[PDB]
Amino acid sequence: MAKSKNHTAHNQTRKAHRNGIKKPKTYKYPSLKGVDAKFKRNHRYALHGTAKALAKARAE
Amino acid sequence: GKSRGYRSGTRYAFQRDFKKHGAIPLSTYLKVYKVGDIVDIKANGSIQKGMPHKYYHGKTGIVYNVTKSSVGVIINKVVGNRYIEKRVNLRVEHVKHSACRQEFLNRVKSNAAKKREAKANGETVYLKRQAAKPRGSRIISTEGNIPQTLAPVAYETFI
Amino acid sequence: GRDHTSKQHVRSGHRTAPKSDNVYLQLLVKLYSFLARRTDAPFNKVILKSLFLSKINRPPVSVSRISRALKQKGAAEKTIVVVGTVTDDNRLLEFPKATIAALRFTAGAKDRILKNGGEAITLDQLALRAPKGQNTLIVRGPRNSREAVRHFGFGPHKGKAPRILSKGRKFERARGRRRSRGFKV
Amino acid sequence: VLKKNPLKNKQVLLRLNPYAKAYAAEKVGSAKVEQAKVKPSKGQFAEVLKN
Amino acid sequence: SRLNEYQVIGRNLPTESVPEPKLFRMRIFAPNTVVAKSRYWYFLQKLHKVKKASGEIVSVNIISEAKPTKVKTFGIWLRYESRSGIHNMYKEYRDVTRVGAVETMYQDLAARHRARFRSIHILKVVELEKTDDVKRQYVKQFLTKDLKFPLPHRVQKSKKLFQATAPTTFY
Amino acid sequence: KKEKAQQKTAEERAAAKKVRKAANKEKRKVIFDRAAAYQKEYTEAERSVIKAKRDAKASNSYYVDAQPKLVFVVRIKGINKIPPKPRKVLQLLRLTQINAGVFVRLTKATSELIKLAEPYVAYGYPSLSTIRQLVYKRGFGKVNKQRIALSDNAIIEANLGKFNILSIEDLIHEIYTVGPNFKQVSNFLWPFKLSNPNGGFRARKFQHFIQGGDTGNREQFINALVKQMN
RNA sequence: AGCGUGCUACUUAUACUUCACCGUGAUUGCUGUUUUGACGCUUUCACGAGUAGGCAGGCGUGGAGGUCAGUGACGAAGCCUU
RNA sequence: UUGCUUAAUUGAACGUGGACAAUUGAAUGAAGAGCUUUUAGUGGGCCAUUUUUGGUAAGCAGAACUGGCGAUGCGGGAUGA
RNA sequence: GCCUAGACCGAGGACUGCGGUUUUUACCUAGGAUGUUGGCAUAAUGAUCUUAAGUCGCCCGUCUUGAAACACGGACCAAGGA
Numbered sequence A: 001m002a003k004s005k006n007h008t009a010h011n012q013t014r015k016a017h018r019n020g021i022k023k024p025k026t027y028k029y030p031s032l033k034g035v036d037a038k039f040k041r042n043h044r045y046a047l048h049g050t051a052k053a054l055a056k057a058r059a060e
Numbered sequence B: 001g002k003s004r005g006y007r008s009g010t011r012y013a014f015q016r017d018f019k020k021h022g023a024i025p026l027s028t029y030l031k032v033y034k035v036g037d038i039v040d041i042k043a044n045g046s047i048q049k050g051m052p053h054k055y056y057h058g059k060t061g062i063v064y065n066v067t068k069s070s071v072g073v074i075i076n077k078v079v080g081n082r083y084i085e086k087r088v089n090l091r092v093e094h095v096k097h098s099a100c101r102q103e104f105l106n107r108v109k110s111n112a113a114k115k116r117e118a119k120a121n122g123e124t125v126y127l128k129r130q131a132a133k134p135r136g137s138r139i140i141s142t143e144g145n146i147p148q149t150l151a152p153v154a155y156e157t158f159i
Numbered sequence C: 001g002r003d004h005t006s007k008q009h010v011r012s013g014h015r016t017a018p019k020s021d022n023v024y025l026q027l028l029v030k031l032y033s034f035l036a037r038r039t040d041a042p043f044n045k046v047i048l049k050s051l052f053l054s055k056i057n058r059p060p061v062s063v064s065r066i067s068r069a070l071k072q073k074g075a076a077e078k079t080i081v082v083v084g085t086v087t088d089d090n091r092l093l094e095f096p097k098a099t100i101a102a103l104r105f106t107a108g109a110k111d112r113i114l115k116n117g118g119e120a121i122t123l124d125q126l127a128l129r130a131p132k133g134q135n136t137l138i139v140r141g142p143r144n145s146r147e148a149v150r151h152f153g154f155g156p157h158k159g160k161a162p163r164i165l166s167k168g169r170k171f172e173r174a175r176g177r178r179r180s181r182g183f184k185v
Numbered sequence D: 001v002l003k004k005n006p007l008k009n010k011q012v013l014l015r016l017n018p019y020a021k022a023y024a025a026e027k028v029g030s031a032k033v034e035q036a037k038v039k040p041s042k043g044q045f046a047e048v049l050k051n
Numbered sequence E: 001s002r003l004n005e006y007q008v009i010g011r012n013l014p015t016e017s018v019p020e021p022k023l024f025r026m027r028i029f030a031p032n033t034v035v036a037k038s039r040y041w042y043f044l045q046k047l048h049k050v051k052k053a054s055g056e057i058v059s060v061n062i063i064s065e066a067k068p069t070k071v072k073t074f075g076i077w078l079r080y081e082s083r084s085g086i087h088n089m090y091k092e093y094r095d096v097t098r099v100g101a102v103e104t105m106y107q108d109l110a111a112r113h114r115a116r117f118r119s120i121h122i123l124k125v126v127e128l129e130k131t132d133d134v135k136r137q138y139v140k141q142f143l144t145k146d147l148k149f150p151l152p153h154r155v156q157k158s159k160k161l162f163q164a165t166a167p168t169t170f171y
Numbered sequence F: 001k002k003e004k005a006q007q008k009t010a011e012e013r014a015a016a017k018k019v020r021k022a023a024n025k026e027k028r029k030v031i032f033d034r035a036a037a038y039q040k041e042y043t044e045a046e047r048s049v050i051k052a053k054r055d056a057k058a059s060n061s062y063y064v065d066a067q068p069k070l071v072f073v074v075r076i077k078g079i080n081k082i083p084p085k086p087r088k089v090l091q092l093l094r095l096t097q098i099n100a101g102v103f104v105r106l107t108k109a110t111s112e113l114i115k116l117a118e119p120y121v122a123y124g125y126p127s128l129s130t131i132r133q134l135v136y137k138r139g140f141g142k143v144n145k146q147r148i149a150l151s152d153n154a155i156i157e158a159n160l161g162k163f164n165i166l167s168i169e170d171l172i173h174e175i176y177t178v179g180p181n182f183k184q185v186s187n188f189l190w191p192f193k194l195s196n197p198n199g200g201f202r203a204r205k206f207q208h209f210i211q212g213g214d215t216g217n218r219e220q221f222i223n224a225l226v227k228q229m230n
Numbered sequence G: 001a002g003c004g005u006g007c008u009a010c011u012u013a014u015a016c017u018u019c020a021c022c023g024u025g026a027u028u029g030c031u032g033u034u035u036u037g038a039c040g041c042u043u044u045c046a047c048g049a050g051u052a053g054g055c056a057g058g059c060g061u062g063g064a065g066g067u068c069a070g071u072g073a074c075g076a077a078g079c080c081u082u
Numbered sequence H: 001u002u003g004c005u006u007a008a009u010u011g012a013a014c015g016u017g018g019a020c021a022a023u024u025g026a027a028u029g030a031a032g033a034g035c036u037u038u039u040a041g042u043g044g045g046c047c048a049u050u051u052u053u054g055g056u057a058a059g060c061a062g063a064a065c066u067g068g069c070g071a072u073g074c075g076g077g078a079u080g081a
Numbered sequence I: 001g002c003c004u005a006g007a008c009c010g011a012g013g014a015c016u017g018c019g020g021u022u023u024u025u026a027c028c029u030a031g032g033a034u035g036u037u038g039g040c041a042u043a044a045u046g047a048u049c050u051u052a053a054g055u056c057g058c059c060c061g062u063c064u065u066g067a068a069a070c071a072c073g074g075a076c077c078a079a080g081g082a
């Protein structure tokens, strides 16, 4: 009495291609989330030291 | 009812190759992966730890993280009208360097060498690849090669 | 028939005139439309499009942001240009002598500029004394500091502000926000 | 305001292609070709007739 | 006018192992050169294991009738496909060119066997030089002594709708 | 005052154009000599191919012509009921209406492109006169995203002069002999908007030319079709 | 005037080509002549199917502020009328 | 540069300074690209070729890709989503 | 290269451009039709109404995958009506 259509993927790719399918956008610096914590911890100190060394070198 | 478990439908994809069962040859564990390498994902059925999902079997991605026994690979997956950045942790038994990249680096080296040669020689070299062109003209001799006539053959039965 | 590669009859989607009905704003638009049409100085085209902007797209510019703009290397003598309102900032310890061109000055901002020997001038005066926008510096206010912007893109793990009328312990701090109440998204 | 076919309008033809005057005046379209009467197929190529 | 006879000569593309590939010729009855080269590649792909992509056409040439105003009897050997199988057959035609006899053969197998052009392979067309090489009586009866015959019941084709005189069929 | 100013302004125009015409007279010499040089090399190319064929017959050899480098592709199918991949291919060839025609340089990449669109196009190898007739009658240039008639050599030179294309005959030469800047010249040409053929098509179009239809490669008969449609 | 096949011409869709006109979108230029319209004028090109639905520009009705020192018993409003 | 790593002056990641400039490293195209807010209707579908399941089968029931009808007139199939 | 038979159209509105003939700051077929002649203005000419002929045209609204439906509401008109 209420038997109806169960499932179909008809028209679904047509809908997806109206405004997609968009590639995700890339950046020069990726987020360091999910990167190994030990590496990320030391990478903080390396970037900090580089900034100080460059600031000192620019000073003299 | 229906069954949609984690490894459903992987009966053949996760089987080992014929007469290729048993221990992993150690070259798998001696390869070195760096962040930014391009790797192919292939599940090894004998290593149940750090496996890909069946979706990532046969996909290729970028290494973004390196741990004790595994790498993190970035994959783009289509979900509806856009891609989603996926991050998968894979033990190195399920990963392999991609060969096309090493070929492309070969081309970069060769191209720099040629441009340096032309620079130091006083000429200019064109370095874009080109698709196959139509062939040019040519003259064919008949010395020992008189054209031989062929005809369609009659029908025959071999029962 | 045509196999259209793009959508037909699409308006550009950029505002080509102020929605404002102010006659004096339209006088300024007339001036800078002439200037952008006859001068090929990029400053005039930028000023022309800026006059079209809506109120939220012209955030107020504080005098402290102006003074930080004037501390750039070589910018102490520039004419600061604001297409919008310049507001006063009492957190500012000191303000220098400067020329500022703006649509509007609040009373405190104008008093502060004039007391330090500066010049608070309008955009037609700027056009008369810098028809190409020579030695100008355009300063824009913070667009994303609006309170409405806190609630844009709200969703699980997005870390945005919920749309809520009261704030307190009983208002949306339970299930869904706390692992002790089920889950936390 | 009106596109004129150079293949039909002579003035537009000469406006676009000045060499059209030299082509016409030199009768390039009906130019004779000097050469000798030859029959280069009389040998093996006559295998067009039978193999 | 439907068909012409062509020769088509081709070979494999030269390679390091085989710098001088053999040249192969075919005699093709086709409406134009595009169809002629297509037929050549069709037959070369069926006989030898060569594809179009690895070969090249060397020459395409009209083969004209030697004696276009000499009455001839031709024997034609055919392989054709019916609705139910594949058959060989031999028929005879009278014409002044090979192309004329081939066009007649195509019409004839269309008429009597419902055999379309795509279903027929022309094995061989031979000019029958002797009266003893002519086998079929439907052409043999036109090779007899002092042949003559009337054309009874001539129907004249009129240029008007209405005729003021009674019809006649004398001739 | 108005009458004297216009007479004063007209004589300014007349004096100014007396100088431009001198400066234009030198440039018209350049394009004249180029077209004279192109005509010479076309005839020299034709006679040399004839000579090489005749020499091959004598020396018991076969001369194989250089494979065609150029095709002209006409869309002869309407815009309804096209599968996605040939539809995209036809869009990438700028063939977005029935009876639109473009020039395509032949390589492996473009050959596979045209392979995809085969049951919707008619194409072949255009002759020199066909190219000239198409460019002269239905030649339009893409100037600032606008279809502009190629009615003056100034229009051609202001848009392709940086590629050493200064005249309509330079453009025709660059198309016919597939030159270094075939890409820019062919993309500058708006897709040709042809009529239906005078005399119609064959009884049924949408099957290959080989099987008696109208689609695919017809290899010298594209010129007869274009004469029907141009 | 049936069936198989080849050919020549011919017929005609809101399709294609050229031209006219309407609209939409873009586009050229316009202040010592910008001059009482610059929300205007002007050069050029492309495009036009549509339910549900969205938006835009307009037409019409009762009443209100302002204006036309507006119409009207020499006929307002209403109504009938190739 | 680093607090990570190496027996190590080994590496890892990110850099300073110097070299390579329009063939910046395949084709074709590109009424341009990117970003944001907000809200309508809808959430019964059906048909055709091919693949395909249950069923003797069905103008039957159920999936896959595509194109359509629904939402669409027009020329043709006499008539017909 | 030349000769030759018909049809449809005439947008724009001082000049400005590109070319051509050079006889020359002139002329041209070269940035869109002009010349000339007859008739009529008590009229041919155009527009609408009625009707005849040719051709095409099922009853709207609605729910629906699908309506002209042997699915539902609607005899007609005015005023009210979300």
Ligand SMILES: CN[C@@H]1[C@@H](O)[C@@H](O[C@@H]2[C@@H](O)[C@H](O[C@H]3O[C@H]([C@@H](C)O)[C@@H](O)[C@H](O)[C@H]3N)[C@@H](N)C[C@H]2N)OC[C@]1(C)O
Pocket (backbone or CB within 6 Å): H049, H050
């Ligand atoms: C080589 N495999 C073929 C596969 O190519 C395909 O063949 C189609 C064939 O089915 C189509 O034919 C189909 O569609 C036509 C019509 C509606 O187009 C019908 O007349 C026909 O009955 C129907 N079988 C035919 N027109 C093209 C082939 N490539 O489908 C059949 C197949 C056996 O799987």
